[PDB]
Design a protein around this ligand. Structure first.
Ligand SMILES: N#C[C@H](Cc1cccc(N=[S@@](=O)(F)N2CCC(C(N)=O)CC2)c1)NC(=O)OCc1ccccc1
Length: 247
């Protein structure tokens, strides 16, 4: 195993799901029965969209979108009135990656805040995001499609499932991407549900650096079968990844 210092940290890339990243997500319309109300608030960007956007910022690509996308919200969603359709005019987008900053603390211009909110909403719509105070997505299977068809990433983009490999071969896939200066999309499921994040480093002793997409919270080094962030209370089952992410 090679040693690779965290690729996202080297570029100051630290995104989150709340403000100002979610200023263009759908505004919540209903109160989930018996729950405290989130009406009038923008939905979370979703960890699937945050992890993908962090990878896209690392490559600063694309300058122009390739294809629009539309989908209909799941009728199960208790936060919006149905039927609810969402649309992103990605094919007309001129992404200004000099306005899409590596991280936001609130001191930024509104041109810069709207630039990252544009990307976060475009990416989220591209992966059929189930919006809410927390926002969910199928993850890897839609990330690989969206990066290729909507944003024109390389044909090398594809999803790999943990159940298809030995432990050695699975880690070898991750190690190859990192040594190519290519961060890796990753996701897993725990008792509380699933989460999507980014692998961008390796300690050379089977610990991997993780960017959970929570603005830096619990970021550090973890083993692939012990992805237990302290912010939870792990995402070690049904693990999948998207590799070969490059222009
Ligand atoms: N931010 C953010 C969201 C947080 C969130 C929001 C709502 C529900 C939820 N829990 S889920 O119950 F829906 N869960 C259990 C069953 C699993 C399965 N059987 O595939 C799917 C995942 C998690 N994260 C995310 O969307 O997880 C992507 C992901 C997708 C597949 C696998 C791993 C991760």
């Amino acid at each position: 195993q090679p040693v690779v210092k965290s690729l996202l940290n080297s570029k100051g890339i630290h995104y989150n799901q709340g403000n100002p990243y979610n200023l263009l997500t759908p505004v919540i319309e209903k109160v989930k029965p018996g729950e405290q109300s989130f009406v009038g608030q923008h939905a979370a960007t979703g960890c699937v969209a945050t992890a993908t956007a962090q990878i896209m910022k690392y490559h600063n690509y694309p300058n122009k979108g390739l294809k629009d996308y539309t989908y209909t919200l799941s009728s199960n969603n208790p936060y919006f009135n149905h039927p609810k359709n969402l649309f992103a005019a990605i094919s007309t987008r001129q992404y200004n990656w000099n306005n899409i900053l590596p991280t936001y603390s609130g001191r930024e211009s509104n041109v810069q805040k709207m630039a990252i909110s544009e990307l976060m909403a475009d990416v989220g719509i591209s992966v059929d995001m189930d919006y809410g105070p927390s926002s969910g997505s199928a993850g890897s299977s839609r990330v690989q499609r969206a990066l290729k068809e909507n944003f024109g990433y390389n044909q090398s983009v594809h999803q790999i499932n943990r159940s298809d490999f030995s432990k050695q071969d699975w880690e070898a896939q991750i190690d190859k991407e990192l040594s190519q200066n290519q961060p890796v999309y990753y996701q897993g499921v725990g008792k509380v549900g699933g989460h999507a994040f980014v692998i961008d480093g390796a300690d050379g002793r089977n610990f991997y650096h993780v960017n959970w997409g929570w603005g830096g919270v619990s970021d550090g080094f973890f083993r692939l079968d012990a992805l237990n962030p302290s912010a939870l209370g792990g995402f070690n089952g049904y693990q999948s990844a998207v590799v070969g992410i490059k222009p």
